[PDB]
Paper text:
RAS proteins cycle between inactive GDP-bound and active GTP-bound states. Mutations in RAS and PI3Kα are major drivers of human cancer. Their interaction plays a crucial role in activating PI3Kα and amplifying the PI3K-AKT-mTOR pathway. Active RAS interaction with p110α, along with phosphorylated receptor tyrosine kinases (RTK) interaction with p85, activates PI3Kα, allowing it to modify its lipid substrate, phosphatidylinositol-4,5-bisphosphate (PIP2), to phosphatidylinositol 3,4,5-trisphosphate (PIP3). Here, we present structures of KRAS, RRAS2, and MRAS bound to the catalytic subunit (p110α) of PI3Kα, elucidating the interaction interfaces and local conformational changes upon complex formation.
To determine if p110α and RAS undergo conformational changes upon complex formation, we conducted comparative structural analyses using the structure of p110α and RAS GTPases in their uncomplexed states. Conversely, the structure of GMPPNP-bound MRAS (this study) without p110α lacks electron density for switch-I residues 41–51, indicating increased flexibility and likely adopting a state 1 conformation (RMSD of 0.71 Å, excluding switch I, compared to the MRAS-p110α complex). Binding of p110α is likely to shift MRAS switch regions from state 1 to the effector-binding state 2 conformation. Solution NMR studies have shown that active RAS proteins transition between two conformational states, termed State 1 and State 2. State 1 is characterized by a more ‘open’ Switch-I region, and State 2 is a ‘closed’ conformation associated with effector interactions.
Residue numbers in the entry: 10 to 40, 46 to 178
Write the structure that this text describes.
Amino acid sequence: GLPTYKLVVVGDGGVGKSALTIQFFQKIFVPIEDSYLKHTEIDNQWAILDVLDTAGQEEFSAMREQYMRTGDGFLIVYSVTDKASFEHVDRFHQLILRVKDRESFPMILVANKVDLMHLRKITREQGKEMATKHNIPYIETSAKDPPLNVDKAFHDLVRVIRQQ
Ligand SMILES: Nc1nc2c(ncn2[C@@H]2O[C@H](COP(=O)(O)OP(=O)(O)NP(=O)(O)O)[C@@H](O)[C@H]2O)c(=O)[nH]1
Ligand SMILES: [Mg+2]
Ligand SMILES: [Zn+2]
Ligand SMILES: [Zn+2]
């Protein structure tokens, strides 16, 4: 069948992992334990996306490493209003690279909640520096209607996987 990409959304609790996933699959924002399946055409090439919306809790090491092993690409999401979620980007990138036993792997740093500009604590420049440090692309998103770069984040991840 069509090429299948297993995309895994990781990040601290409350950063907007589910809101981004639901916006991407249902085009809704309302403030399902299975991974989500859809067809999508990216750069005139149809594909099947299999998207796992992870839980921001500590979870279990066995369950966590398992879905990291099966992922073809990862979105590392933080909230621009949450400093701790931004600092934990280093932990998510290192942990996924450790599981993969790789120096690099298709991932994109996602700075979510950029609509909350008066609560924003992580600047765009801080976000780009973080992405540059980890050698991954940077994109700013908002899952609140009207959504910002939600489709682009997932599609660009597939593009990275394709150009890997
Ligand atoms: N203003 C705004 N609120 C957002 C955005 N994304 C998520 N939220 C809000 O922030 C809260 C947490 O979002 P949620 O999607 O549950 O985050 P999560 O990363 O899945 N949390 P968990 O790890 O506990 O599953 C919700 O109230 C949601 O509506 C965004 O881009 N903008
Ligand atoms: Mg969630
Ligand atoms: Zn203002
Ligand atoms: Zn890193």
